[PDB]
């Protein structure tokens, strides 16, 4: 069928009904009262499955859109249809079908070309062809524009996303996850934007669904996402926003904003431009970091990445082999000399990043004319703490020569733990960086953990409570209190600064990286 009794809140008709008037899906009782939340979170793969199975598929959500988003009007006839692609692997029936229902009930059929369901080699009895046919038989109860396609073997996100993209028909495709619910008028703002310029990749903002209670919650994250040298998307910090031009430190919720990085895999894009700009790096293995490789390459090769604060999508906040490291390595091909820093932050890994295929990627980058990563930093993300590698002047052991020991993260680069003094051994547990633009002293393996006068590590904040100065005589001076740290007594205490005190004079290797990153041999 095409449509079956439409209406507001159910734009594609009454979904999932049998030819007898009864829902083709039997909701489950209320979850048991004696429910061990940690064990039920497992059963569901990161969320309360008992509760999900008790909630309706036609679950109505709150309108997360700012008020000024509803005063916008869209002429649905002058908009181009789009193909929504939902990849999934072993996603439970209740959350997958609730995603489909949410889309169909919250998308005008006039602008929705199709809803592509990509089975990435699932093994659950209700998905498989050789199973009980629950999914397949339930789809017959949905509009015909809902299509299912399969992968013999699980290929990962990059592999599954491409399968649906290549299969789509609309000029524009929208990627969503398998555990989502939409706010009203979520697709209209994206289509209007990609219509005026096909080089635009537009991200809907992300709200959340609690893993344990399914309560709808505001994402809170802004629009602009930077990145951490651990190669992870990272929302602009307050001091990073302060570096924006005044006209953009607090823009209206209705206007689109550029973002250096993508929050996940949730976006829309004109199909033709998507392939012209490189699509995905199909040699990325399973899941991880494809979103950064897409953002860097997109900006560098004549594209634009934008958010849409008037396009909200709820997304369950849930509570791999050597693949995740391989992915990061390949991403560094787009980072040029900065790869030297990122390589050390992830621990100078030595894997098989599939070099022969990565070279073919580098010739493509050259043949396309993509800009450099230096341009990327100076033009797309100049608000970062490291815009040029000269902003990392020190990277090495922090040694106090008098006691013959150097600092040690104590196996804990993560924030919250006290730092020790240990005999130097040249390992990554004893190396530290310096970000001069913010006065931060961090272990190389975690640029989110910053040293404090307390002697401990803590989450970095671009403020006075984390600003250090490395003096000409080797003192580590906390700028706020004008005190210098000492190794006296194999203990880290703050004292009065005196270049004569040998316990407060330190050595810090200078970070003078090469102008070109040479990938490690395999």
Automatic annotation (TrEMBL):
Mn(2+) 3 binds at residue 417. Belongs to the glycosyltransferase 2 family. GalNAc-T subfamily. Residues 396-506 form the Ricin B lectin domain. GO terms for biological process: protein O-linked glycosylation. N-acetyl-D-galactosamine binds at residues 233-235. Mn(2+) 2 binds at residues 234, 237. N-acetyl-alpha-D-galactosamine binds at residues 233-235. UDP 1 binds at residues 87, 120, 154, 178, 318. Coiled coil: none annotated. Residues 83-214 form the Glycosyltransferase 2-like domain. One of its GO terms (molecular function) is polypeptide N-acetylgalactosaminyltransferase activity. This is Glycosyl transferase. UDP 3 binds at residues 87, 89, 120, 154, 178, 287, 318. Keywords: Disulfide bond, Glycosyltransferase, Golgi apparatus, Lectin, Membrane, Metal-binding, Nucleotide-binding, Signal-anchor, Transferase, Transmembrane, Transmembrane helix. One of its GO terms (cellular component) is Golgi membrane. Disulfide bonds join 69-310, 223-307, 301-370, 406-424, 450-460, 484-497.
């Amino acid at each position: 069928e095409v449509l079956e009794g439409a209406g507001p809140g159910r734009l594609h008709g009454r979904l999932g009904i049998k030819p007898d008037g009864q829902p083709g899906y039997t909701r489950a009782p209320s979850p048991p009262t004696d429910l061990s939340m940690p064990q039920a979170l497992a059963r569901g793969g990161g969320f309360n499955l008992y509760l999900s199975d008790h909630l309706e598929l036609d679950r109505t959500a709150p309108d997360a859109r700012h008020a000024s988003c509803r005063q916008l009007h869209y002429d649905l006839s002058t908009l181009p249809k789009a193909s929504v692609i939902i990849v999934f692997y072993n996603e439970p029936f209740s959350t997958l079908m609730r995603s489909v229902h949410s889309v169909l009930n919250g998308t005008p059929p006039q602008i929705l070309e199709e809803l592509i369901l990509v089975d990435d080699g699932s093994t659950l009895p209700y998905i498989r062809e050789d199973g009980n046919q629950q999914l397949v038989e339930y789809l017959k109860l949905l509009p015909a524009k809902v299509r299912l396609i399969r992968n013999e073997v699980r290929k990962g996100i990059v592999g599954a996303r491409m399968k649906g993209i290549r299969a789509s028909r609309a000029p524009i495709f929208a990627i969503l996850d398998s555990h989502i619910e939409v706010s009203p008028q979520w697709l209209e703002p994206l289509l209007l934007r990609i219509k005026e310029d096909s080089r635009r990749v537009v991200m809907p903002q992300i709200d959340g669904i609690d893993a344990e209670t399914f309560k709808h919650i505001a994402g809170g994250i802004g629009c602009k996402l930077g990145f951490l040298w651990k190669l992870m998307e990272h929302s602009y910090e307050g001091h990073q926003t302060a570096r924006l031009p005044p006209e953009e430190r607090q823009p209206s919720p209705t206007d689109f904003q550029t973002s250096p990085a993508m929050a996940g895999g949730l976006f829309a894009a004109n199909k033709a431009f998507f392939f012209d700009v490189g699509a995905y790096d199909e040699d990325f293995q399973f899941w991880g970091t494809e979103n950064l490789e897409l953002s860097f390459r997109l900006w560098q090769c004549g594209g634009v990445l934008e958010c849409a604060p008037c396009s909200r999508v709820y997304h369950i906040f849930r509570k791999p082999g050597d693949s995740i490291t391989i992915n990061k390595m390949r991403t560094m091909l787009w980072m040029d000399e900065y790869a030297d820093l990122a390589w050390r932050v992830i621990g100078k890994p030595r894997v098989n990043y599939r070099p022969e295929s990565l070279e073919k990627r580098r010739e493509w980058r050259k043949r396309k004319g993509c800009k450099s990563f230096r341009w990327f930093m100076e033009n797309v993300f100049p608000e970062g703490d490291v815009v040029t590698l000269d902003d990392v002047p020190y990277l090495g052991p922090l040694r106090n020569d008098k006691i013959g020991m150097c600092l040690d993260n104590m196996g804990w680069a993560s924030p919250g733990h006290a730092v020790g003094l240990e005999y130097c051994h040249g390992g990554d547990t004893q190396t530290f960086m310096f970000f001069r633009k913010v006065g931060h002293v961090m272990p190389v393996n975690d640029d989110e953990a910053c040293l404090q006068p307390s002697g401990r590590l803590d989450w970095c904040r671009g403020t006075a409570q984390f600003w250090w100065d490395f003096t000409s005589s080797g003192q580590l001076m906390f700028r706020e209190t004008k005190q210098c740290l000492s190794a006296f007594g194999r203990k880290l205490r703050m004292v009065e600064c005196d270049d004569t005190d040998p316990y407060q004079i330190w050595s810090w290797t200078a970070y003078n990286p090469p102008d070109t990153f040479t990938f490690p041999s395999v």
